[PDB]
Amino acid sequence: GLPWYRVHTVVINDPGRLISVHLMHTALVAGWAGAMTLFEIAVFDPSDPVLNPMWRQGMFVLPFLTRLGVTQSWGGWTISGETSSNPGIWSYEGAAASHIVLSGLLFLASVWHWVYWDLELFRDPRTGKTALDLPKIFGIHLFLAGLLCFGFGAFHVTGVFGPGIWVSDPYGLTGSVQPVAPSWGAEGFDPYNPGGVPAHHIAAGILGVLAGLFHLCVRPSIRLYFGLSMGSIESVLSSSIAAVFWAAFVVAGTMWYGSAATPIELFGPTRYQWDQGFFQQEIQKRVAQSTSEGLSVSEAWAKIPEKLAFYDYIGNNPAKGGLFRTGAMNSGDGIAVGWLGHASFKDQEGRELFVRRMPTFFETFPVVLIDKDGVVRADVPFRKAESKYSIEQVGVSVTFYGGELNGLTFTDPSTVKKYARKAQLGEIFEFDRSTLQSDGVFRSSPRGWFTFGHLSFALLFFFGHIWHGSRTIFRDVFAGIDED
Amino acid sequence: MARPNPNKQVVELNRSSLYWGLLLIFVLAVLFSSYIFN
Amino acid sequence: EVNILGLTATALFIIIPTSFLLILYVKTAASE
């Protein structure tokens, strides 16, 4: 008979049934895309796009929606802080239902090709056996791929006929969907330049169209034909798997490392941004600049936006979750409801101490208040019975200069230790943990989930590619040699 | 009366009863989903 | 906030009988 890991091999030599299973898969994935978009709209809360962004809510396909142009829905809200304009048919739920209708149409086409499979289109004219002209088929799909890339690059992203790209502020403050002009210089290959994508797509589509033309007009060579077995469908299977996990590696690498195609306002901050003190140095230099000219402390800090302080918090970090720390990051440590401000710590005689921040590798890091230069001056002690670093005898006081807490200084109780612990994670924020029965441990970012899944899939498809390459090169010994 | 069972019978589900059963399940579904969702 | 109890109830009461009747129909069509 057939093994359970072999049930799909009955359609290797039947192109019509290959169309059938392909269309069935296209139906399944279209239905999944529609179902996930409507599910995430159902769970999605657009109440606070400033402090409770969708990437803090475990959002996965809506950031891919928003990145390409759709920003509003049918319910009367927009995630950009504005009210809805005219929504039309191409909203979030409109795209979901459209993919559902595509799922149905592709399902019915799969059933059609399953029932009608012996079309003469699939039959070779010279020999009469069932055969497929793979170099010509590849030329066709290369021409269409180049045409789609050229259309998407010259009409959609350029804004002449499409909306553009979700571009953002460098620090993730101000962002929206706007057209961007292509850059043909070195900055065009600048990965963080939004303008590189249209020039990329135009050049890539033109090159794909021309390469499709050579593949349509030019035939392969005998040495190459018997080299990688172009006349077999398993060779194109293995090569396609190779190309798709190559692309998956590229996509995962760019997703982890940040790019113009990875908006921080849709996907959250970067572990390299946190380790490299990006938002921290931004907030501190803005405060230093405001302090240098005019405004003093406790009001200059109020000039710091609500977004930036939330970005400078390791609970927003993609590199703090777990495999089975499951769900939204809001379900981890509550929903953010307000920013306290910058916890400023003074000694008893008076000098500014700084809290050593908690790096990504550490599940628990010691809380130490260290000197202006970098000397240890105070710490929460483990022994609590020796030295001159315990808080109650050093005499530090926590001040704050921010939104909710601005001028009430605490020095006596354990509140200073509590705020040192909180500011040891970054900026201090209030979270409500009763709305989502939130737990307290740090969940993973949608970037982290995306990159984990796609790196694992890329390596698994490396196995798939190497196996199908083995099977294609070695078809004589896999099938039979008959005592020779 | 022997090792194999003479009382063995095979199950037969024609397409009409298939369609009637599917219609029954989905009509029960449309009737009670609104009530379980509540 | 998504009623998952009713969701899984509806999903199971669809999936189990339609699959069971599909098994019976497939064995009726295969074994005439």
Partner: peptide, 30 residues
């Protein structure tokens, strides 16, 4: 997902009745 599940159920009923009309067993014995 409140309205979408009723949408699935209604589409399932419509698909079942469509298949019962067209992809039915032919009427045998008179």
């Amino acid at each position: 997902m409140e309205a979408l599940v009723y949408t699935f159920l209604l589409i399932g009923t419509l698909g079942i009745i469509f298949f019962s009309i067209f992809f039915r067993e032919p009427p045998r014995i008179a």
